[PDB]
Amino acid sequence: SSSMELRQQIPTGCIKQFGQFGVPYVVGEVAEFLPDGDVLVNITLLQSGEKDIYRLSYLLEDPEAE
Amino acid sequence: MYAIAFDLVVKDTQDYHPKGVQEAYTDIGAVLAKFGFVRTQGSLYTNMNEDMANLFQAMNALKQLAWISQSVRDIRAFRIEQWSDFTDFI
Amino acid sequence: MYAIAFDLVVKDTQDYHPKGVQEAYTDIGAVLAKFGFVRTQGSLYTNMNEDMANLFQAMNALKQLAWISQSVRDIRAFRIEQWSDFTDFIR
């Protein structure tokens, strides 16, 4: 919880995917530091090019895009 | 052949879905499984049954999810002919 | 209206594409755009000029990519004979 210790946890560059049935996305950098504790990560959906925003707590649990 | 194609808003889906966004995408496939639509692109589900009253009930089943109304970016149906796979990649 | 849909194996594309997966997506789209196929709703590249000969010229152009063969999961073309949009969920 240092704003480094948080940031060095978002795997910027990883190409993950929302579930077994979700679309793949690419992990951006920080968007906001929510007081819940976790962080809003900037994200761009790979196959549509849409940019979006995602909780890091959710992010770290999705699998790698296959 | 019929297709359903859709996109969720990820910020909206996480806020509104009870469980994750993972859960949203997995939920939808299961509803669309009730009416013959298999996942073929993650954002494109196909059924090969051109009955419209199937689509209709499938769409109505999808509108039953309370979070869809607040979290979908876009959702489309279309009627697909001349489905064609390419494998001249050697 | 014709549509092209495609998926790439992500590990394989990272190996063989000289830059990366997000450029392999963009670079494939560059080709398809040379044949009027353009993505407007996410993930589907559509043309609306239903000339089968043009679609084939694009698949032909596509194999001209060094890394495509070893880094493509799926690619499919098909016809969208009719479509309709859904905003009855926003209700």
Tell whether C91 is covered by a domain: no
Tell whether B67 is covered by a domain: yes
Tell whether C41 is covered by a domain: yes
Tell whether A2 is covered by a domain: no
Q: How many domains are contained in chain B?
A: 1
Tell whether A66 is covered by a domain: no
Which method resolved this structure?
Answer: X-ray
Q: List the one residue out of A57, A44, A51 whose CA is nearest residue A10.
A: A57
Are C69 and B90 in contact by the 8 Å Cβ rule? The answer is: yes
The Cα angle at residue C40 between residues C36 and C43, in degrees rounded to 5: 100
**What does this entry list as its resolution, in Å?**
3.2
Looking at chain A, list the stretches that DSSP marks H as alpha helix, in order from N- to C-terminal side: 56-59
Tell whether C72 is covered by a domain: yes
Quickly count helices (H) and strands (E) in chain A.
1, 4
Q: Going by DSSP bridges, is the β-strand pair C74-85/C2-7 parallel, antiparallel, or unpaired? A: antiparallel
Which of B62, B77, B80 has the CB atom closest to C79's CB atom? Answer: B80
Q: How many domains are contained in chain A?
A: 1
Tell whether C89 is covered by a domain: no
Tell whether C18 is covered by a domain: yes
Its domain, for residue C65, covers 1-80
Task: Give the closest-approach CA distance of C23 to chain B in angstroms.
Answer: 19
Tell whether C62 is covered by a domain: yes
C-alpha–C-alpha distance, residues A9 and A39, integer Å: 10
Which of A15, A48, A49 has the CB atom closest to C10's CB atom? Answer: A15
Two tokens, residue C25: 């997506």
Tell whether A65 is covered by a domain: no
Its domain, for residue A21, covers 7-59
Task: Give the closest-approach CA distance of C13 to chain B in angstroms.
Answer: 14
Interface of A with B in 38-57 (CB under 8 A): 40, 43, 45, 47-48, 50, 52-55
Task: Give the closest-approach CA distance of B60 to chain C in angstroms.
Answer: 9
Q: Dihedral (C-alpha) C24, C26, C28, C34: value to the nearest 10 degrees?
A: -160
Our measurement of the distance from residue B56's CA atom to the centroid of its chain's CA atoms, rounded to an integer in Å, reads 13
Test A20 with B26 for CB contact under 8 angstroms.
yes
- Name the helix (H) or strand (E) containing C62: helix C52-63
